[PDB]
Amino acid sequence: MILVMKPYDSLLFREPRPFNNHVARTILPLPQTLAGAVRSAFEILGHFFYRYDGKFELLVESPHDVTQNLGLVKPHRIDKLGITILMDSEGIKFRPFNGFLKFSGLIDYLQGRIAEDSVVERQKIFKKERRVGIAEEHFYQVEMLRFSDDCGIAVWVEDGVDFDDEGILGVGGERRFVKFEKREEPECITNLRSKWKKIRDKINETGRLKIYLATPAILGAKGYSSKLDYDLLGDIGIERVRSVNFIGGKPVIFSGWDFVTRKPKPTRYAVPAGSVYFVEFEGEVKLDMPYLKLGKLTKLGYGLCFMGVW
RNA sequence: UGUAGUAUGCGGUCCUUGCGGC
Numbered sequence: 001m002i003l004v005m006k007p008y009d010s011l012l013f014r015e016p017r018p019f020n021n022h023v024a025r026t027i028l029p030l031p032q033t034l035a036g037a038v039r040s041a042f043e044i045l046g047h048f049f050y051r052y053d054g055k056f057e058l059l060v061e062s063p064h065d066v067t068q069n070l071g072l073v074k075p076h077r078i079d080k081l082g083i084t085i086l087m088d089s090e091g092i093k094f095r096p097f098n099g100f101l102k103f104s105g106l107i108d109y110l111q112g113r114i115a116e117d118s119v120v121e122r123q124k125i126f127k128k129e130r131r132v133g134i135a136e137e138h139f140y141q142v143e144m145l146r147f148s149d150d151c152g153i154a155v156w157v158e159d160g161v162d163f164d165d166e167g168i169l170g171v172g173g174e175r176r177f178v179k180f181e182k183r184e185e186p187e188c189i190t191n192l193r194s195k196w197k198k199i200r201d202k203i204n205e206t207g208r209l210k211i212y213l214a215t216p217a218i219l220g221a222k223g224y225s226s227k228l229d230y231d232l233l234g235d236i237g238i239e240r241v242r243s244v245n246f247i248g249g250k251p252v253i254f255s256g257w258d259f260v261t262r263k264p265k266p267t268r269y270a271v272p273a274g275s276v277y278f279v280e281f282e283g284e285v286k287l288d289m290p291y292l293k294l295g296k297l298t299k300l301g302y303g304l305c306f307m308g309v310w
Numbered sequence: 311u312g313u314a315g316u317a318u319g320c321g322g323u324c325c326u327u328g329c330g331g332c
Contacts, residue, residue, distance in 0.1 A: 133311070 001162075002185065003038060003155040004050060005171065005178040010129055010144035012173030016253055016267070022140035026128060028273075029145075029172075031215060031301030032256055034155055037171040041180070042161040045291065046215045046304035049100060049125055050154040058154055058188055059100035059120055060214045061274040063109065064247050066101070067094045070114055074310055075245040075278045084245055096249070096274070098122050103188035110199050110210070110290075110308035125151055142174075152178070155301075159185075196290040202309045204284040209238075210308035211277040216252050216270040217295040217303030224269040226251065228277055232294060237286030241279055248275025270295075270302070278310070 013033055015025045034047050049059045065073055067088055077084035088094045098121070101109060105118025129146040133139045147153075163182075170177040203209055211228075218224060219232075228244050249272040256265045285307065294303035 136311075139311075 001157050001159045002183045003041075003157060003180055004152060004183045005037075005155065005169075005180045006152040007147050007176070007178045008168075009176050009178075010146045011171065011176060011178075012142065012144045014173050016255060019140065019142075024140065024142045026143040026145055027252075029153065030252075030254060032254070032297070034153070034171065035300040037169060038155060038157065041163050041167075041169055043158060043299040044301035045156040045158055046301045047153060047155045048103075048214070049151060051120070051125065051148070051151045053150045056186065058103045058186065059125065060103070060106060062097050062099045062101050062119065063212055063276055064096040064249065064274050065210075065212075065276045066097045066109075066114060066119070068097050070097070070116060070119065072112055072114070072310075073247075075243075077243070084243060086245065086247060100125055103186075103192065106306070107188075107192050107195055110212075110306065111202070112308075112310050124148065144173075154183075192290055196307075199290070199307065199309055200285055200287075203307060206309055207280065207282075208310050209279045209281045209285065210310055211279065211294075212306045212308055213248070213271060213273055213275045213277075213294075213303070214306060215301055215304040216273050217305070218268055218270045218297060219295040219303070220269065224251075226271050226275075228279070233279060233281070236292065237284055238279075238281040239283035241281055243278075243280050245278040246275065248272050276308075 013027050013029050015027055029047065031044065031047065035044055038044060051057050051059060067073060069090065071088045071090050073086040073088045073094060075084050075086050085092065100120045100122070102118050102120070105114055108114060108118065126145055126147045128143055130141060130143050132141040134142060165182045166180070168177050168179050219226065219228065221229065226246060226248065228246060230241055233241055251269045252272050253267060253269050255267045258265045287307070290307055292305055294305050
């Protein structure tokens with residue numbers, strides 16, 4: 001089941017900093033923010049963007065593996081120095097490629113190949129819009145997310161829940177609203193599920209595994225850290241792990257105002273979406289699905305990760 | 311948001327036979 005929400009207006013997701021600070025910024029939608037919308041209409045698998053321009057397609061955050069020239073980076077290790085570096089096969093230094101990757105390109109991406117037409121830049125999906133003088137000194141400037149003409153937010157939720165099909169509901173920060181409809185699973189997820197067996201066989205035969213985080217994950221057990229615990233990987237069937245090479249970005253620091261306790265929630269650090277881990281696993285993967293949940297708060301749409309080969 | 315005059319200063323001037331011849 002997919003909740004397709006077209007924003008009639010701009011959307012706001014409050015930054016952790018308070019806003020007498022009139023200046024205010026905006027961030028990408030958070031799983032805790034969108035979870036409240038669906039619960040106002042169970043677990044949430046995650047959320048992507050959707051673009052309906054002639055055809056309807058779903059876009060996830062561009063993996064940090066992909067470079068500017070659409071060149072994949074693989075972690076290769078030198079035993080002479082005994083150190084592993086992420087080589088792009090065209091240079092030793094690289095930068096992450098911002099934008100979004102389609103599911104139709106994602107299916108091929110996990111095999112180690114990507115096409116130019118399978119990616120979309122960030123400027124073609126949504127932009128940031130600044131408003132000044134909103135309301136002698138009461139004026140505050142607020143940045144919001146302005147979506148494209150034929151684009152919106154798709155929320156991927158397991159088909160075990162049901163509710164009203166179509167309507168209008170309020171989401172985000174300030175009192176805005178979007179039009180939501182219930183759409184069945186597109187052919188992209190079906191194709192991914194069909195090719196999951198082949199890609200899992202490739203992963204098993206090659207002895208290499210890649211974890212791609214399509215959503216932010218709070219992996220911290222006692223505190224909060226980007227380190228990948230071996231116990232979590234052992235649950236899926238990994239007998240042993242040799243080396244772990246994680247590449248991501250600045251951790252997303254977020255909290256919230258808990259209305260139940262009338263007090264703010266504890267501040268939490270999460271691994272940013274699009275980060276990729278490379279793991280040299282031993283044995284085979286027993287997972288029967290191409291998507292798994294990691295960390296805590298996985299019900300709200302946190303820690304959705306895909307499997308890939310290299 | 312509230313308050314706020316595209317306004318002040320500048321000459322359509324200078325130059326020219328209503329003549330030439332019966």
